[PDB]
Design a protein around this ligand. Structure first.
Ligand SMILES: CC(C)C[C@H](CNC(=O)c1ccncc1)Cc1ccc2c(c1C(=O)O)OCO2
Ligand SMILES: CC(C)C[C@H](CNC(=O)c1ccncc1)Cc1ccc2c(c1C(=O)O)OCO2
Ligand SMILES: [Cl-]
Ligand SMILES: [Cl-]
Lengths: 148, 148
């Protein structure tokens, strides 16, 4: 549980927002890319795994699951790649809700930044800090408890 | 102490590596940029602060300290900007050693990636995971203890 993350890809302003959600806490990391490719997903995972102890990743679609570059990055970083098939079906709805919510925050900050990428990072900040505990507090507690 | 970070800028392959070090743990985040501008530093800080509870940043030089964009980002994210003047003089030597160490790791992984940015992220991973606790474990413990 402490090492489980879910990939999520959403669209805005003709661009792609790639999101990694720490399932147990709701904590996110996100980036803007021109389009989802195996290479971009692989690089994103390498960054993520150097920052948090990523054990398992539920990939967001079959193309990324299949991608030889994504597979290489998961091998390199010691990540077990799994499908993102929501056998538990509330999972989809939770991600759907998060995308809607992230887009709402992006709209609220949008005019404070020229570039979408900046607005996305502001939205990540607001999401992770919103409180009772915040997502940022929850992920730290979960992992700290796991270490010990 | 749990919220104190230090900026560090180093050069390799004609490019700039921007590093943020969590002083109490030795944990790092890093990115490759073409050159160190206020805008790049500001964006880097926005990303950092959405991911970890950044209270104080010791900026790496006077241009970034002065930068109106860096100041804007610190205001937005609730970061106290301080100078990076090592009144305590072992500080500079610790950063020097870290840059040398990071460059060593980059050399060790360099041939496994086409692009410098990828090698830097591999180096971040190795640095943060190296154990007795790792930097990644230490930062989580420090912040978890602080929350309580
Ligand atoms: C996971 C590692 C082991 C391999 C991948 C794929 N690279 C190769 O197969 C390769 C190895 C050696 N020489 C050339 C290519 C690295 C990678 C992933 C994602 C990226 C990248 C890179 C990159 O190569 O910089 O660039 C931006 O997005
Ligand atoms: C910290 C926030 C409040 C302000 C900065 C500076 N921007 C403005 O002053 C501005 C505000 C409104 N319309 C246009 C410009 C945002 C920022 C920081 C770093 C970056 C950026 C941006 C960006 O504007 O996207 O782009 C890549 O590196
Ligand atoms: Cl880690
Ligand atoms: Cl946070």
């Amino acid at each position: 549980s402490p090492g489980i993350w879910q990939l999520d890809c959403t669209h805005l302003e003709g661009k792609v927002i790639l999101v990694a959600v720490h399932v147990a806490s709701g904590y996110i990391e996100a980036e803007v890319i021109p389009a989802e490719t195996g290479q971009e997903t692989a690089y994103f995972l390498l960054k993520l795994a150097g920052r948090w102890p990523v054990k398992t990743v539920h990939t967001d679609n079959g193309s990324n699951f299949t991608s030889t570059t994504v597979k290489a990055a998961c091998w390199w970083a010691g990540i077990k790649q799994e499908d993102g098939i929501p056998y538990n079906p509330q999972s989809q709805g939770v991600i759907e809700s998060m995308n809607k919510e992230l887009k709402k925050i992006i709209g609220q900050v949008r005019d404070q930044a020229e570039h979408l990428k900046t607005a996305v990072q502001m939205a990540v900040f607001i999401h992770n800090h919103k409180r009772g505990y915040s997502a940022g507090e929850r992920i730290v507690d979960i992992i700290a408890t796991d270490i010990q």
